[PDB]
Amino acid sequence: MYTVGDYLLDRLHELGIEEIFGVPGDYNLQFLDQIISHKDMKWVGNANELNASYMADGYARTKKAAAFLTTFGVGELSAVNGLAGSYAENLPVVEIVGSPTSKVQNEGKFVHHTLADGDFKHFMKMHEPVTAARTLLTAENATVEIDRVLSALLKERKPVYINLPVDVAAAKAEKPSLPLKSDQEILNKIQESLKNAKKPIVITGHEIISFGLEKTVTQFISKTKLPITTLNFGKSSVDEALPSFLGIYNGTLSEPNLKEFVESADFILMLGVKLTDTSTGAFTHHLNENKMISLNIDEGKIFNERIQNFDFESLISSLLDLSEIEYKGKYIDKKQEDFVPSNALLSQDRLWQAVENLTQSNETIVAEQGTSFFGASSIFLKSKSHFIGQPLWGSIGYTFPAALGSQIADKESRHLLFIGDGSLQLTVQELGLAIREKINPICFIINNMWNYSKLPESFGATEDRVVSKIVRTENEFVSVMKEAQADPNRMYWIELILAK
Amino acid sequence: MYTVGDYLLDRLHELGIEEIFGVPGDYNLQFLDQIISHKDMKWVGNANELNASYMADGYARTKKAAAFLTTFGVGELSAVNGLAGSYAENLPVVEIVGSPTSKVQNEGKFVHHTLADGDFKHFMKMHEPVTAARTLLTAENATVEIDRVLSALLKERKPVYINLPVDVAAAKAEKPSLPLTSNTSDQEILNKIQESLKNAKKPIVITGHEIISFGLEKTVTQFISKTKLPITTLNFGKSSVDEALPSFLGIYNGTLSEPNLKEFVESADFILMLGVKLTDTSTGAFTHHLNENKMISLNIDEGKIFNERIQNFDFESLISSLLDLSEIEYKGKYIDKDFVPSNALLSQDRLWQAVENLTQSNETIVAEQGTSFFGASSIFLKSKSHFIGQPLWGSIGYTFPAALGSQIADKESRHLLFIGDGSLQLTVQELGLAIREKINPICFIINNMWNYSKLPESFGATEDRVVSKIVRTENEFVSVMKEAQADPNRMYWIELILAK
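Predict the joint structure of the above. Result:
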């Protein structure tokens, strides 16, 4: 039989979701079965819900849609932080919440995972400010409601919430039938501005990643040869290997040449950007609104004139159909110091120098808030690479599960995680999943309270699965980097000890 | 100078809170210092916020008030699930949330830990359905607001929320001078209770969780002692009376109750229910038979005298008044109510038989949902003992941090934790705190896939701090139980392997 559960899963498939994360609970058991049954969908169960939500986030970053399952009350409220972070940084994550039978909910009984007030609507209400759409399904409204909220996900690429009562998931429903899903004036104004500019700057941001427009932007920048920079909030919204990519613009913390280039530009095109404290060097950015066109998901501005009505995705896509754009100016001077290692102990500055030099193409780099994010975000990535950081929401522990989710999202991109020992502790339990799912990320755990080196062994990993290293010197670092990248079939668990 | 922070902490001292849990964050650092400075208050920092909230809950259960500190956004939303569970089971927990300077909040800036919408009020709104009172402090309203919400905590003994902006915590304030009877229908009620009790040929007192909430356990025990009244508790409120009393019957849990108790309770001619809430898991899936027509029930918010609702009364002093009843003495019969180990492997039923026989006085027993809770809740505790279970909210992982919090709350009560391997994983990181704070609980981890045995060693414990055991047989169990109870200066990490 085809059921509501089936409908939801097929819909999720259409969004490109191939794995669902989460945690079994009594009110979501039956639907969990349905996920198993669907051959086009794989269940990847976490240790805890919060980890699940983080892992779905990372998955969304790469796969461009994600979903995870929790249980009413205890599950959903565990995940809320981190669904919040998916709202803040605009990732398309579906949260499915298995709830008691509608019979139980209507009778308002004091059942487990409630406040024994017979109210089944509190937790959805609590999810209001961190979801673009929500629904409590019924047998009648199910197909309509699923479609409504998944549509909102497509529109906004912000997380959405579906409360799925046991019996509603098992109820019959009819398959698919139909799939789910001022621009001209704007384009001309952009094109006119670009033809006129003697020194333009494109600045792209997180919302580009949200809609998986990275390749569009890259292709746009390539043909035009337009100067481009990103914020750290949206690092990799363009291929950093392009010759017209300047580096990261981050207020007065920007490298001086980039800073001067950006802030002396005669035209600014900002795409999918939000200026936050940590992404603008504590608001020390100088982006004159009078010579700037900015486009975002929800709104945009043409030279201080707000625009309301447009389609963000296709408006960006249209940048490719512009014409007679070619930048003939200079850029900024880069640097070509090779990392030559010694037996010197590894320092922070040397680490990132080495990472930049040794990183390869087709890699995703994930960096946790703290020394790791600060160092890693300034790196120029290799061609066809990606970056995951969470500098707006800034939830510690995030990058570990996120890294794993992302790695699962794209097996073809080798993930390199940079996380501090302090932070890793908060989400370390997902090491279990890493071992089970036989995924192969390169994990660097920077030191500075437990002995993490021998953690894989504790979780039941052998040397055929995880390789554990300790690095103290430059030579050791180089060696282990190359060794790790040379072996795509094992996960690497590398403890860095940094000097001074 | 004396500050708002100081005010809050002095107020917290008056509630009897001697330790504050939580996690440092940039928006709560300065206030954290204030906790350190206060000699009558000790900071006990957790690994994660969720753990903190669970640990505060456990602390409240024993100390009868608790507090923990988180950081705006990421911190508070991490803890929300534990706070929800504190609301559900009615524990007096203060959540303090350090937030950005009021200057920043008013200017509505896109700072870290926000949704970059310049709204600072979302997260408090999300806490609405799980707090009895909430406040965003200002320099002006601080003393009033602190007192308002801490008063509500006193009234309802449900959790409360204080958002504390950096600058507001540092703002000048005066030491509190004043410290923190509703109706005379209390007198009528007492007489009706007394009249009913004198007349009853077979009365039953049933006490519940709300008794623990107000620390009325000793009152109830003294009441039952003088009168010799038959008493039973639900598992939702186990230990709301001293189970060692001769008139304590056991646990009433619907048709899952021991037959004699079941028949006693359900054939009673008068029922006095104090602080009771009937949930699915605490009745036998609602197989309780408590005739409302021969029953007086008192709760925090409301009560019923033979199907006549009362609204306005003081729960605490109304219970306290039960002691001033007179010419109450039960003259009736009660119900009818020893472990020899072998080399036989340890089974579930044998475990709890052994625990019941070997448990000592002045102990707290903490049991996680699943097998542990089912077995442990049926035990008769020794004199002056306590029980922690969370059968309403039923959040897995809870009992580990909760156990630790409770243990910190009362150093004089030896905690015995019974948790499943599955659940321990969710909150295991707090093992760090256990080692640091040099507390000495007896932890039984039922094994039912990582190597937990070597966990203390990982977290830096030596044999002088934690003793690690593996138990398979009955003899081994008895031996390790006695050995653990015989050594009050070390924590015990005991892995139970159960049979079929």
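Chain B touches chain A through 55 residues (CB under 8 Å).
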